[PDB]
From Swiss-Prot, chains A, B:
Sites where the protein binds an alcohol: 48, 67
UniProt-annotated binding residues for NAD(+): 48, 199-204, 223, 228, 292-294, 319, 369
Gene3D superfamilies the UniProt entry points to: Medium-chain alcohol dehydrogenases, catalytic domain (3.90.180.10), NAD(P)-binding Rossmann-like Domain (3.40.50.720)
Organism expressing this protein natively: Equus caballus (Horse)
EC numbers on record: 1.1.1.1
Keywords from the named record: Acetylation, Cytoplasm, Metal-binding, NAD, Oxidoreductase, Zinc
Cofactor list: Zn(2+)
GO biological process: retinoic acid metabolic process; retinol metabolic process
Example of a GO cellular component annotation carried by this entry: cytosol
Domain of life of the native organism: Eukaryota
Protein's name in the database: Alcohol dehydrogenase E chain
């Protein structure tokens, strides 16, 4: 029995930037008041986890990364009321406390208890539940899913349907929800519109799914890797373009293709240049552009404000704009009811011990989502 | 009868940047097909007219400036159907052709026939109706209202109520409608919200009027000239702040005052740095910031896209988002029914011949709107 005791288990520790993950034994403390200890079942490999290795995303090291996952509750601390031992759950990298001004607003989701704006790499109480070779290890976004067991605050976990398939619905913990919501909730794509989607990875394919569900008439995928085009068309793209095939900047190409600019554009890569290109390709009087990709730390973009004065709208969002704890269970129920598909995003399935091979697949351009199974 | 004949009259010609206007005789050709010749009655002095003098707003010289005005139709060219000789009219610096994709869109107002994106300083047919000292003189934004007589395209004029007081309703041709619509139509300010307005000139005061009409609970005026505060409070500001009084950046001050950021902010000055400050002071998850001020020609701002990724919305607009020809007559009817006030914007009255004194008053900080009478 493990309840109330320290657990010794395997985890993927990142000791320093620009090194492979180290798969080794860690110690996981029992949950304190208002905390939940979870046995992980499946976790996806997202580009944001890779950003921690490359130095694009800054968060305290050493760390247990991972934020897109699903598992089963092993034990609960004093005072927990929304999950119980044995429940299927998805960790929430954006929390939902329900009591701050953002949680109370009709359209906000970036809860003020988040560990994203100024990352500390701890539990809500400022301490860590992990140790490795006698050294305390940091948490990541309040989730830390690259471990057989994790501990999360109650505001950072949602209970889901007991019959759901965890090796698929882990994607609702990040990539699917982010891209789909960016289209249907943040941009509010309209029927008959023309959309442009920059970046055709797991998140950009989810944006395409949302634009198709909203009734867009045209969905133009943009990527420098033409091997991404076939799957983009399968999930709804009507046409695909590679900027390196053209002797003119792609914003000009897209403006001409759309007879004067697109209705909705999405940056789903993480580059300053493509954020400005995506804004510029939407129609100057009524276009909308949404930033989803995460750019290198502490770098500013340059742009001419006349792009906005004519009438464009520019926005960004975390997690597709969804209030996390309310939305995650509903998205799983919609999946169970066949309202959307997750299989098109999954290209590879590997045991957790093959995490480094899964990161090599992402970096080489060969995969969309690899799902790691514990 | 002057119909079909060249009219010799006085106009304010700008021959060179950074010099006074020259009040001298010009020749005004009769209107061609789908053109309207107007006897001007009153015109306002707007900061955008000053931007032509300072080289902030680039348009070809020599030029007859002026864009905020009202007058009476002298004659109509062949095929005109929307106005007749003797009608009271307001020239429209943003046209409304009714036939392009923008005019047909529910939100759009930046008609594709505009002379703003890349000013050419002509009529729609690419020619000029003005000569001075024997040379052709450019038009400005299709309006050129600093002249006893001007010629405009039919898509750039609206018929208004025959009983309208032209010395007041000329402000509906730019400053009032721009500020009011930026609040009520572009931002869509909500009841009980907190707003911040940067710049307390004629346009910023009109933004305040709109925020108060929309039911905002708090309206914070921001200006480096404290002499602008008394009038801002008269029209609805609840508090006013001068950035020069504070040791901390004003975005930090405003975030503290609003217990975490404002609901709606407006840049109504024309500086790159205040555009970035205004964005930053709105709440990071659900705030909205609207750019109204005109930026220095061809200059780019620098900003961190993490301001948008958390959830902020950034937009701009011309003429308050209003479809010009549909909206101007309705705004005049609302003024006649006392739905809004224009007298608070009018601080000085001068004859047209004293135009240079009117620009001196604006540049010294002493005026809001000076109205010139022909
Ligand atoms: N806002 C959020 O809440 C949120 C959550 C999900 C992920 N993220 C971010 O979303 C982005 C996408 O994540 P993903 O997992 O889909 O990544 P990914 O690496 O699988 O996909 C990115 C795609 O961009 C393409 N690309 C790279 N450089 C390009 C360039 N110069 N021009 C055109 N295409 C280019 C690649 O070929 C690739 O197919 C990442 O930056 C990630 O950090 C954000
Ligand atoms: N978008 C549009 O359609 C549109 C139409 C109307 C006018 N314009 C622009 O709107 C702006 C305002 O026009 P206006 O006629 O009200 O001008 P104005 O000059 O009367 O008002 C601007 C105000 O900004 C204040 N100011 C200047 N620098 C400042 C700083 N660093 N910080 C804080 N306050 C500062 C001044 O003291 C002044 O009271 C101008 O840039 C004009 O060109 C845009």
């Amino acid at each position: 029995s493990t309840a109330g005791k320290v657990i010794k288990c395997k985890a993927a520790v990142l000791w320093e930037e620009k090194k492979p993950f180290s798969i080794e034994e860690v110690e996981v403390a029992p949950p304190k008041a208002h905390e939940v200890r979870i046995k992980m079942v499946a976790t996806g490999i997202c580009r944001s986890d890779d950003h921690v290795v490359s130095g694009t995303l800054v968060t305290p090291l050493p760390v247990i990364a991972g934020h897109e996952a699903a598992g089963i509750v092993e034990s609960i601390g004093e005072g927990v009321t929304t999950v119980r031992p044995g429940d299927k759950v998805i960790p929430l990298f954006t929390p939902q406390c329900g009591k701050c001004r953002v949680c109370k607003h009709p359209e906000g989701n970036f809860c003020l208890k988040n560990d994203l704006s100024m990352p500390r790499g701890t539990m809500q109480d400022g301490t860590s539940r992990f140790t490795c070779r006698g050294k305390p290890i940091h948490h990541f976004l309040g989730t830390s899913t690259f471990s057989q067991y994790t501990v999360v605050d109650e505001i950072s976990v949602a209970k889901i349907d007991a019959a759901s398939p965890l090796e698929k619905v882990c994607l609702i913990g990040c990539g699917f929800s982010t891209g789909y919501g960016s289209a249907v909730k943040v941009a509010k794509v309209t029927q008959g519109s023309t959309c442009a989607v920059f970046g055709l990875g797991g998140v950009g394919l989810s944006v395409i799914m949302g634009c198709k569900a909203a009734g867009a008439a045209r969905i133009i995928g943009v990527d420098i890797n033409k091997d991404k085009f076939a799957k983009a068309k399968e999930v709804g793209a009507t046409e695909c373009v590679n900027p390196q095939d053209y002797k003119k900047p792609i914003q000009e190409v897209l403006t001409e293709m759309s007879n004067g600019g697109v209705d909705f554009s999405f940056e789903v890569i993480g580059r300053l240049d493509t954020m400005v290109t995506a804004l510029s390709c939407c129609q100057e009087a009524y276009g909308v552009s949404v930033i989803v990709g995460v750019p290198p730390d502490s770098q500013n973009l340059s742009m001419n404000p006349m792009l906005l004065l004519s009438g464009r709208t520019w926005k960004g969002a975390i997690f597709g704009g969804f209030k996390s704890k309310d939305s995650v269970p509903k998205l799983v129920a919609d999946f169970m009811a066949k309202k959307f598909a997750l299989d098109p995003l999954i290209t590879h399935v590997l045991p957790f011990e093959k995490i480094n091979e899964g990161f090599d697949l992402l970096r080489s351009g060969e995969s969309i989502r690899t799902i790691l199974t514990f």
